[PDB]
Symmetry: D3
């Protein structure tokens, strides 16, 4: 029901100690990480990355948080790229990837360079009608050949991925939507309103199912590292079953686990 | 020529012994498996899956059948999912079937029913078709082909949206994201599906099975290699060099491969 | 588990009714044994043999009292010498062994050759008698198995040995097979079933759910999305056995919207 | 966007000497153009054509003045209509050569790109299509198939549903259909085909050639398993040689001493 | 190089401040050693132990004086006998650490403790080392790197045997199946381990990280590509272009 | 395969014309031998050497009388000690996609780039004096391509990391025990045994061998492997009736008619 989904959002500030970002949590379980350097179009420097890593780790471990929003301060930029070590954004990438909660990129204005890869790493992207996308690597002597390349191809296909990287053009919201680069385009004024609705729709669903599916979708891409995530959830599920608990109920008691009492399914 | 492609279809019933499905065969080589529980929007129960497996196995082994259509009875549902895990076997069976399998979708293709249409090689959708998953809404998920293979169809952003929110999508939305192959008016659903089937029936069945195996091989690792190499082995038996081994068994001697060219 | 239990006698009960080419037996303690029974032709399989093995394996899969399957050949001279020299449904049998959620053990005496060699490789484990002989013959007789027979063989013995085995088609004795990691152990011929049964019993003492998940996980390193289907399929099954997994179905029995808000959102 | 420079006239120099089936030209600003020149048979390739295209592509690859390659067909009616029916599977070698070419390869498509000719445009990094371009496979209609990059890689472009449709039915698709499914990068009026193609080439020419080759290798690496890793790691090895730490090994030869890596930072 | 250098005494400096479950030490010549220090429970890890190992490993990663990490257990009887699920984080961290990590194994490496040694790039085993999984025996499993990556070490037949039966394997059995890199007498365990570390320390650290990433890339799909391309990007920055 | 045939003398014919760095020879019974001929520098390759090996291998590939290729070094002391102190990557691809078995015949040193070359060969026959290992990290270099990943598919991940990270040397027995080479023979019998192995493969179906080589590469090479494997499937298809119906329908004017062919399960 739209009334619930479009209800006002009550944000509580958790930004204490952060210089480059704001970090907020809603009552209903949304964490928002906001890059707060609009003076440089929300470009990240190594400190920014360190803070985002801290905030994301906090959101991950907070049982009241079910969904994370990543965004930039103001209306003009999500993140315009690189401005605690030089390439620690790779760590942040892996952390978004393996976060068992959906991460949503909320994009107004520029999502460019390293900043473009960040939105792609997020599970979903909600774009304002003023959003601008693209890579800049080859123009400025750099490249992201990791998830920035391969994973981009799993989103827009190999022809578009080569075009995006090789020419380093800019793409508006409609172009991004048509190639499947973003999930939806909404008027700028409604950007948070629609993003929050999408978040709430996910919050109504099973968090265990979401994490299993996220791991399964990563598993199509990440080889054994994906298997680690998917199997890791299987192991966790197993512990919540009787057969899984029989080991712990037994083996502590130096006796012996007895699995004979369990069905051997087809 | 359209007159051939849009010619009437002569269906013969082969439904004997089936409770949940109809199974029919056309003269020109199309097998049609129809989920027949419209009273529950064509949801499958385990018996339904067992029968579909039987019908598909039959269609696979019938040398007169070149293409299979999977569909639901009536206009309101293709399949609305599991009834409120042998469907995994049915999935693998659709996957490794050496003949093209076409999902013919009217109304709802939802949940386990949505995965079934995705598993089919092609999907022909009526303008009233509705698509989506429900797993996370009802405490379940398909993290197998229902996730990874979905991503190979619509891309990772859309796949995550479809699974994480569990919304419904109409025919046009499905077409735009590449989830279905075409959208036709409901009244023409079988007419157009049959035309697509006939177009494939005019082509080389060996070529089709090799290509199907090759396309699965981009997804299914060694299991895909088993399919692809399996066809290679079959092709090899149909060649002179491949027959020299068997003929050497007959003539009570050693095979002699020296008489064969060693190509670049 | 104590040797007295592991080496206790075995009581096979016949379930071979209607089978021409195979014997099919089940033990009280949960072992199913499928025995190719054409020792006159060194246990070569013909299409009927494959059809019967498929039936027996499907039966063992669906029997909740069965935890482990043994695949073997009648007599001491051959496990299986390949396809009958006198269509390709053995590929179906391969996929069936692969996706069987219970451990399948190849018990090999004498020849495991050609299609018969691929069969033992497909099995999760191989217990070999000291008289066992292994190898491929494809290139010698105008054929090949480039599926699991090639790729999966490489995942067992490595790419150099896999190329040697296929390209030359030599034979390898039990010790050579053991040294290259092709079989799990070598035992005297007289103790073949005794030791095989012990290995089966050791697995039977363990969690069947853990075994199926691990089997699926190990296949997943090889079988791309087909492996993900197996692994995720177990995850789905596990999920149904949890409270959160049941809430969906209970919201149906009790006629209400599901409420997942009452569940923890773990890290 | 300096359209003045992106739409400046192109100065082509002929390098076709000794070629029977193709034209081969190079521009002053670094574009090589390989043109299949058999328009009487809709630019179908025979084995000689493939051999010549392989030679021309190898030349373009080794020419440091060349940054981008255009692959196209003579005239307006066909890019390439496939293998010559009236006649070597050496087109597979050409495929692998396009794939591993460390420079962007651009398919410039007018009229028919069909069969083997359709796979060729797909192998190219980008495809610029005229509004009259026609696409599709024919394998299953004429007892053949491309189950290699023609299948798997097609799927990485248009998705698995469309890939199966394209192969199983062997229909033809017009430029707009190709664009909508992501099969080509852009559709332009026929009269502007080379003008726009050259603009795209020049935009790439303005960028770092090392970055382009690394990215091309990285994108292939999502598809080509260890063969992809060979390309990607190969560029890493090349980059390493251009660094001080990479040169210390070679210099420890020149000054006759053991290499000393202790003087280098051990980064996180 | 020369054995006198490789077998020279090792000067350890303690960096264990604030740790309850582990010792953490650094040598002058660039080796960091993380020691699980719960020998009473055969060096089993609890969640705190994992948290501390994660901290120590992050520290070693960011210390430019450190070229190689040793992971080991206190005493002679156990490397680690096994076990919220934060050990998965530790696994990824060992995996993506751009410096070689060496498991130095005395006595038991079992269960989760067995997976940890496998995750390390190399394993130096004492003649008394014992290896194996226990998952299926105690209602658990590691179907991630504990399964697939194990297969990439010992082959699919042995990996299935190890997991399905959950037996124990002695040092010689582990060596024969390629599970460990070498077996040395217990009394020489650290001496030989330190030698292996010093041999790596003599080599190019950039080469080592690129190779480690390349070897992971054969296993880890796009995550492996991220590591490998990441190094390429880093190299690119060090060039004129 | 009776030993008298397998151990019969080998009649080599020289085809080295125009080569500076290599010898290239062919036997009557279908073996091509490429020999790196710079024993003064332990058979290290320089770019010219690679160019010549590429030419010789391309020739062997296109010679229908050749079924198997031996790659080796002149003398007894070295197979190849690596790059001379990047076209070798092309030579690697070329060994990889050569539809005929390539056998590394290794005496003495196979080191660095020279160690990767033996690994790329389908099989390796090693003399009891053979020495193996990488040197990259010692001399500021690395091979992170097939030199890494494919090495792991041979000896496993633990041994691969050891070989690369430490850059030690390994003798024949160590190489055999880790599965790095296929067999170790006395130095004096190196060619005798290598030729036997070649002859054993020469007795087998060359189509089967190329399909299997492609299938084994396919476990490693993603879509590039699929290209090889499907390429053979396409070739096989052309040799069948159903495959020829397309071509026969063009050269007879008509539409192809596939209805007359069975639709197998
Ligand atoms: Cl010609
Ligand atoms: Cl604690
Ligand atoms: Cl405490
Ligand atoms: Cl392996
Ligand atoms: Cl791979």
């Amino acid at each position: 029901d739209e009334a619930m989904l479009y209800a006002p959002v009550e944000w509580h500030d958790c930004s204490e100690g952060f210089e480059d970002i704001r970090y907020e949590k809603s009552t209903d379980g949304i964490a928002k990480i906001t890059i707060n350097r609009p003076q440089v179009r929300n470009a990240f420097r190594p400190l920014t990355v360190k803070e985002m890593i801290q905030a994301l780790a906090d959101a991950r471990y907070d049982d009241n948080i079910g969904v994370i929003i990543l965004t930039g301060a103001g209306d003009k930029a999500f993140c315009s790229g690189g401005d605690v070590h030089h390439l620690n954004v790779l760590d942040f990438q892996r952390q978004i990837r393996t976060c068992p909660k959906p991460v949503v990129a909320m994009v107004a204005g520029y999502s460019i360079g390293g900043g473009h890869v960040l939105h792609m790493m997020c599970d979903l992207t909600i774009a304002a009608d003023n959003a601008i996308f693209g890579q800049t690597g080859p123009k400025v002597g750099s490249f992201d050949g990791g998830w920035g390349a391969s994973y981009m191809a799993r989103i827009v296909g190999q022809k578009k991925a080569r075009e995006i990287w090789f020419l380093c053009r800019q793409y508006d919201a409609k172009q991004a939507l048509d190639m499947g680069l973003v999930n939806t385009v909404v008027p700028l004024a409604d950007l948070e309103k629609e993003t929050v609705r999408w978040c709430r729709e996910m919050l109504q669903n099973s968090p265990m199912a979401l994490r299993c599916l996220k791991a399964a979708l990563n598993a199509d891409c990440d080889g054994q590292a994906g298997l680690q995530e998917l199997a890791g959830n299987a192991t966790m599920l197993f512990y919540m079953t009787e057969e899984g608990q029989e080991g712990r109920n037994a083996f502590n008691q130096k006796r012996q686990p007895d699995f004979s009492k369990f069905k051997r399914n087809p």
